[PDB]
Design brief:
heterodimer; A: 173 residues; alpha+beta; Hypothetical protein af0941; three-stranded antiparallel β-sheet; two-stranded antiparallel ribbon; elongated; B: 442 residues; alpha/beta; Purple Acid Phosphatase, chain A, domain 2; OB fold (Dihydrolipoamide Acetyltransferase, E2P); 2 domains; seven-stranded mixed β-sheet; 22 strands; binds zinc ion; DNA polymerase alpha subunit B (chain B); DNA replication (chain B)
Chain lengths: 173, 442
């Protein structure tokens, strides 16, 4: 299940280069069934007629900014004690390991856990890739009619290229 | 924009001089003759062949233990220590302990918070506080591998009485051919290359003019080229991809300096927004090069140990000085030069980034660090550009240059030029191949 898999992930935010309002993205599509439009089709501010698809360059630059932030957050290495009564927080990995990992140096009977785990970082990157994987969001449509009406209406070969680009912004890093 | 910078009047001013700075026209032969640029390395055969893409704590632990154990093994041989005692073993007689300095909190290290974390091999990684009240002299920082002597009667505290001094690596031993190199002039510069209020890169253009005029043999340019901390980069106000702006910057330099015949050496920074943010960093990727330019341009990693005409250069764009300086504690009298102490630590810890944990926001892949960020030898020249004031100091026989940044805020910065020529073979060995250095204002 995609909704729960990316439930704790941070949503991609990027302010309209024109009106200035912050747009939030969590899926390729915005809305449901028939009135479904690619989230990147229109600004969220109704008095802004600029299409985010016009500022693909600014979005890619923002994704890079964000992705850097996450990778740096992971590498900061904050560790926190699993004992509720200790909760010692440190960036110093202790060389003294117990059977399940670093031994908290405050209380000496609990293991230190990564504050931002590698599994959280990996899920976050997969999310940033999922919200721009147009081909996949389309294959997740049952009827080839619903898809192709949509594919013909918004997903031109060029727009599909724009999405592929954003979707792969991930591996530049 | 860049108003203040372009109206400066200090242009060309020599703010620091080292060696026989006079007696050398700061002109290189350009592309002329034999210019030999070789990237150095520290071989390794300890690391396994299956790596994950996100570090596992057990792996970091491994790298840190080896750091202690490996250096300790050398120090033990040098100072002919007989045995290392486990940190937790109590004794009435003085003991010699091997470990990594650390702080007992998340704050700044102070003479009351020092703890010594032992290696796994002898102490199973245990920690014990260290009392420095009886220690006459000391310079310590978190991450520092040290050998201390003292009394630990209860096994819960070491009253240090002696702190062995760091031992540097030997210098590179030149072959006979290396003595056959002619004088070379090397220019060094570090970003930012644009004032904090503009994206006109006026300072960069001025530096390009300098390169063409002085026609140095080699130019070592440190990033950031497209600074992640620049107001306009951070706010994503730019209207072009980061990668494209980066390539343009590179193009301007490569093209704008074609006529000079100088070999360009680009060193990445953790602030280069378009590039891999984890340290150590791999070389930039730039393919838009003629076949001529390819013989004039080189992309190295960060850090990098580079041999220029037989002279070994230690190169790092990371502000290790500022980071280490903010965490070091000392005590002697007060006739001590802070930077010389910090530079001494870099040369005695054998790493391009000995501080651990690192400054908060410096991302380090420790398994890569282990393989690519060690010092192969004590360099002849160490280029450590920092936010700290520019300088040129001779430390343990190594000329350490901090050319400062080319741009500081909205004001002009500085860059530096070195003159090299390895002297005649015999005599009291060390004859620094670096003859003179100058830090000039852009
Ligand atoms: Zn808008
Ligand atoms: Zn604890």
């Amino acid at each position: 299940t995609d909704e729960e898999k990316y439930r704790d992930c941070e949503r991609f935010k990027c302010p309209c280069p024109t009106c200035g309002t912050e747009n939030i993205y969590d899926n390729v599509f915005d809305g449901s069934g028939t009135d479904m439009e690619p989230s990147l089709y229109r600004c969220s501010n109704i008095d802004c007629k600029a299409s985010p698809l016009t500022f693909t360059v600014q979005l890619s630059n923002k994704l890079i900014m964000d992705i850097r932030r996450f990778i740096k957050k992971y590498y900061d290495g904050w560790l926190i004690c699993e004992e509720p009564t200790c909760r010692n927080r440190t960036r110093h990995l202790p060389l003294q390991f117990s059977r399940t990992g670093p031994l908290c140096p405050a209380c000496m009977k609990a293991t230190l856990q990564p504050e931002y785990s590698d599994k959280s970082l990996y899920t976050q990157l997969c999310f940033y890739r999922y919200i721009f994987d147009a081909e996949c969001a389309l294959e997740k449509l049952t009827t080839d009619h619903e898809k192709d009406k949509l594919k013909k209406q918004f997903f031109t070969p060029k727009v599909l290229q724009d999405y592929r680009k954003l979707k792969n912004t991930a591996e530049q890093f | 924009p860049s108003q203040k910078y372009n109206s400066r009047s200090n242009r060309g001013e020599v703010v620091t001089s080292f060696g026989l700075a006079q007696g050398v026209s700061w002109s290189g032969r350009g592309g002329a003759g034999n210019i030999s640029l070789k990237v150095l390395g520290c071989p390794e055969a300890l690391t396994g062949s299956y790596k994950s893409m996100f570090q596992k704590l057990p792996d970091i632990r491994e790298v840190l233990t080896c750091k202690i154990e490996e250096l300790g093994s050398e120090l033990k041989e040098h100072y002919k220590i007989e045995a290392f005692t486990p940190l937790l073993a109590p004794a009435q007689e003085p003991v010699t302990l091997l470990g990594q300095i650390g702080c007992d909190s998340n704050g700044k290290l102070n003479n009351k918070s020092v703890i010594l974390e032992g290696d796994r091999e002898h102490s199973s990684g245990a920690q014990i506080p260290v009392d420095l009240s009886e220690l006459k002299e000391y310079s310590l920082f978190p991450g520092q591998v040290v050998i201390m002597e003292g009394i630990n009667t209860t096994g819960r505290k070491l009253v240090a009485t002696k702190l062995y001094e760091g031992v540097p690596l030997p210098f590179y031993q030149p072959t006979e051919e290396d003595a056959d190199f002619e004088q070379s002039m090397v220019l060094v510069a570090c970003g930012p290359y644009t004032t904090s209020d503009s994206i006109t890169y006026d300072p960069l253009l001025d530096l390009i003019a300098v390169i063409n005029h002085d026609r140095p043999d080699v130019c070592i340019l440190f990033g950031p080229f497209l600074d992640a901390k620049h107001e306009q980069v951070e706010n994503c106000l730019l209207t072009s991809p980061f990668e494209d702006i980066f390539k343009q910057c590179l193009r301007t330099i490569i093209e704008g300096t074609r006529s000079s015949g100088s070999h360009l050496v680009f060193v990445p920074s953790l602030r280069d927004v378009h590039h891999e943010p984890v340290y150590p960093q791999p070389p930039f990727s730039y393919s838009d090069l003629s076949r001529e330019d390819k013989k004039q341009v080189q992309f190295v990693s960060e850090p990098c140990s580079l041999s220029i005409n037989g002279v070994i250069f230690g190169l790092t764009s990371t502000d290790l000085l500022f980071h280490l300086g903010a965490e070091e504690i000392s005590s002697s009298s007060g006739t001590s030069d802070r930077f010389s102490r910090i530079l001494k630590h870099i040369l005695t810890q054998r790493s391009y980034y000995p501080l651990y944990p690192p400054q908060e926001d410096m991302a380090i892949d420790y398994e890569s660090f282990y393989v690519y960020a060690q010092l192969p030898v004590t360099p002849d020249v160490l280029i450590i550009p920092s936010e700290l004031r520019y300088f040129v100091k001779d430390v343990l026989g190594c000329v350490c240059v901090n050319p400062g940044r080319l741009t500081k805020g909205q004001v002009g910065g500085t860059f530096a030029r070195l003159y090299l020529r390895r002297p005649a073979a015999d005599g009291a060995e060390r004859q620094s191949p670096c003859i003179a250095v100058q830090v000039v204002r852009i």
